[model samples]
Target: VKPQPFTFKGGKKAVLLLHGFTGNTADVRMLGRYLNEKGYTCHAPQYKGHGVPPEELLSTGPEDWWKDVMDGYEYLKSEGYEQIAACGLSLGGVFSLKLGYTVPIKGIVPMCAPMYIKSEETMYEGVLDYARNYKKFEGKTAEQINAEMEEFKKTPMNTLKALQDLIADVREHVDMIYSPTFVVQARHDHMINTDSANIIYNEVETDDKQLKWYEESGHAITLDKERETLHKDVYQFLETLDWQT
Candidate 1:
């Protein structure tokens, strides 16, 4: 079954939880439920072109994904939630940071987010891996998977470059982020430079900011072994925020 978006209705305090690129609500679902259990409402929205074939991912870029992110935040607001925080993984993390600097939010948690986008070659590796895994799960033969990958390569590079540009743009404005920020990173995540957490923690203008590193988890920290601690820490951070309710 394709991954889908979800919302857990809990309290007036809401969290706009977002997933990584090529992933859907599954990326943030665990964290969302963990927070919701603590009386916090959470929403994990699927980005456009995600939760489907990897080839469709190229049809959307950071701009379109950002729109989805904002829509998630607006969705919480329209549902009567006034206090909202953004917590996202990878590409979602970048959008979370963008939301902090460009819009009003209670706080932001950018987990395993990259301050610098990877080289196109390296960036495409994750996309390829996702496709390979999907096909493997679908019972496709190795030869068939390779043939499909060859077809995936023809979609063009400009779309991927837009993601790089988005990260660059967000990095430039990192200093403008004024919300309470909690930056989380995993030391072993090869997908992104671990220093990304340091840059975000150091650059955000907010005096009430923190940076935490997970020793055991990798890129998908939300679903990794340290996820329980990650949820607890995020909950504590939210508790520290000045809630209107």
Candidate 2:
């Protein structure tokens, strides 16, 4: 089955949700739904090559996903939303910054984003190997885990290199964002270096920035064990922006 983008329309404050690389919209779907329920229209756009065979992503690059995110935001704006917030998971977080730099976004929340990859083995080489051998999930049934793994896409070296290039590209203009930025970092994330929090906090020109670390989650904080807490933290940060007015 082909995975499709997920969206919920509810209020004037619209948020564009960006998913991580090599994953479907499901990775960020939970947060998007909850944000919508809290009176904001939320959209998670599925970039090309995601949820497909790993080889398919070889032809894709970060620019394509940028277009994907940009389109999602513009779509909501066309619907009459004046206040916009942007958030994303992992690589999606990079896209959030891209939007923040370009638009006068009300707020930006980048969850589990890495300024630098912590585990070279995990990102540079082991990712494909890990995906090849599927295992039971921590809190899911065998069948559910199988279904979930089926949606996980593995990247080749080229695809990963594209991600690295994108990171460098985003870094060059990190100081351009002045929006109220909230960064969510995983204290126990073995893949993404925790230094990412510091990198963002130290680099952004925005005085209205905060970094929060989650002790119980990993790189995919939006779908991790402490997802509820992540949701609450994100909601509170956005609330402080008074984006709903």
Candidate 3:
């Protein structure tokens, strides 16, 4: 089923799913569905500057994105979800960690989030190649992709600056995140370096922390071959929390 905001019946627990850059609520919907089937209420809010055309994303900054997440948290609180867990992928993972640090959550799962975007020679070459000869996985033509790209192209300079600001902000406050955390890193992720994941694991100040490494998956670990394992691990982690019993 396509992912949409939902509050399930018999939902005693809550899980908030956040998607990655250039992604929509549906990006994390599958996981939401799985969690729902396991009897947990799930929500995947559409971030500001997302799910609309790409231009909106290009025009927005990190603060706007953070606001959207805060709004989601408030909504869950309003719905009487007392025990909430936040999970996110890629950029969304960064936001999840930020929320877990600042908000009162039962637990956090940050999947494929990076502390920094590495700039190695091979990586640069790969990006250049993809940009030069880009092809959508669904077989969209170059013109169609370019049309979509135009909306998100030339991201506001301030937005990049804001991302840097957020990284600094997160780093400064890493010790404040006291909730139990499960960090998942894909071994073959192309977008983020392994060191970035290590940095997060090192910096977070939580005794109840665990890391799961997906050796075969790429950046999209939830949708990749290790998806089932990922789901099981998250479910197991949630089960261990004291809130449900």
Name the candidate that leads on TM-score: 1
Output the better candidate (1/3) by lDDT.
Answer: 1
Model 2 — TM-score against the truth? 0.84
- Each candidate's lDDT (Cα)? 0.88, 0.78, 0.75
Off by more than 4 A, model 2: 117-159, 242-245
Give the per-residue lDDT of model 1 (tens digit) for 44-102: 88989888777777778878888888888888888899789999999889999999987
Put the candidates in lDDT order, highest first. Answer: 1, 2, 3
lDDT of 2 by residue, 103-211 (tens): 7799889887777743334674555543443233134576775665556544244556667777877877789999889988999987677787788878888989999
- Quality of model 2 by C-alpha lDDT: 0.78
Pairs clashing in candidate 2? Answer: none
Tell me the TM-score of each prediction against the true structure: 0.95, 0.84, 0.83
